[PDB]
C-alpha cells in the first residue's frame, strides 16, 4: 500500500487499506531459459493511474507526432508493451519471480 513505480502505477495496484498477504519466491530455474524468455511483458507507459484492483488490459499505438501512423510502431508512434528478457546468466534483482 502507498507505493510508486512502473508496477504500482501502470500495472497491478493495491488499495491503501489492504487486508491480506503478499507471497513471492524466486523461480530462476523455472522461467529463465537460454536466449531469453520473451513471454512476460509489462506496460511501459500510460496516460493515467489505475484504480485500486483495477487493470487496463488492452493496448493501442500511441501517436505522439503529427502524422497518423497506420497501426505501425515507428518514430513518434509507440507500442506500450516491453517484454522481459530473462536469461539464466543474469544476477539477482533481474531474475524472474512469482
Amino acid at each position, epitope marked *: 500500500p502507498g507505493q510508486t513505480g*512502473n508496477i504500482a502505477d501502470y500495472n497491478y495496484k493495491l488499495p491503501d487499506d489492504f487486508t491480506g498477504c503478499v507471497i513471492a519466491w524466486n523461480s530462476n530455474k523455472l522461467d529463465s531459459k537460454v536466449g531469453g524468455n520473451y513471454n512476460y511483458l509489462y506496460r*511501459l*507507459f500510460r496516460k493515467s493511474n489505475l484504480k485500486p484492483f483495477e487493470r487496463d488490459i488492452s493496448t493501442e499505438i500511441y501517436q505522439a*507526432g503529427n502524422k497518423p501512423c497506420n497501426g505501425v510502431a*515507428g518514430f513518434n508512434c509507440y507500442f506500450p508493451l516491453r517484454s522481459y*528478457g530473462f536469461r539464466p546468466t*543474469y*544476477g539477482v534483482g*533481474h531474475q524472474p519471480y512469482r
Partner: antibody
Amino acid sequence: VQLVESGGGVVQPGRSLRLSCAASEFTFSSFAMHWVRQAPGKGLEWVALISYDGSNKYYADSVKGRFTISRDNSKNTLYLQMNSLRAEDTAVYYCARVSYPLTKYYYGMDVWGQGTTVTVSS
Amino acid sequence: EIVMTQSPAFMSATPGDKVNISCKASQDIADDMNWYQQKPGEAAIFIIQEATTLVPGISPRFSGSGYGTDFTLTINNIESEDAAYYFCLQHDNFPLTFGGGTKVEIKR
C-alpha cells in the same frame, strides 16, 4: 521534430541569465526534458531534469540552489534561470528530449539541440 | 556517482577495417546505456539503445555488445563519413554520467 534554444551570451560574474528551449512538430506536454552542458575541452555533464507535468525536478550537486528549471506547455517552451554565475559555468548548453512519453521512470534521451554558448567574463 | 571510462580517446581509421570502442563502468548496470554519435557543427544522433538494439534508420554496419560492466561498440567497413564524436551514456541512477569521448579520423 526540432529543438531550438537561444538566449546565451556574455555576462559578468554573479549576475543572472535565462535560456529558452523551443520544441516543435511534436507533443511538448507529454515528454520530459533534460538540460545538459559541456565545458570547453571537457566531457559532457548532466545538469537538470524536468517531468512532463512539472511536479518532479532533479538537479546536479554543482548547480543546486542556483539554477531553476521550468516549462510552459501552452507556448511549448523550456526555461532555465541561472543566478550567481561563476567562472565554472562557461560551457555549451544542450536541450534534450526523453525517448518515451507519459513516463516518470525512464530517463533515456534521443533528440538533442545544436547548443548555445554562455561566457562568464568581465 | 558511477564513473564511466571510454577508450580510446583518439583513433586513426584505415578504411575498410573494423573499430572497437570500449565503455566501462565502476558499478554494475545491466543494459542501461546508449551510444550516441555527434558530428561537429550539428546535433547528436541516437545510434544504439540499451547496448544491443540498433535504432531504425541507422546503417546496419554499427553494432553493440556487452552486459554488466564492459560494453563494446563495433563499426565495420569504415567510410569517410564515419568520422565523428562518439560517446556512451548511462541512464540507470541519478546523477546521469557520460563517457569520455572518442574521435575517429580517416588515414591516408
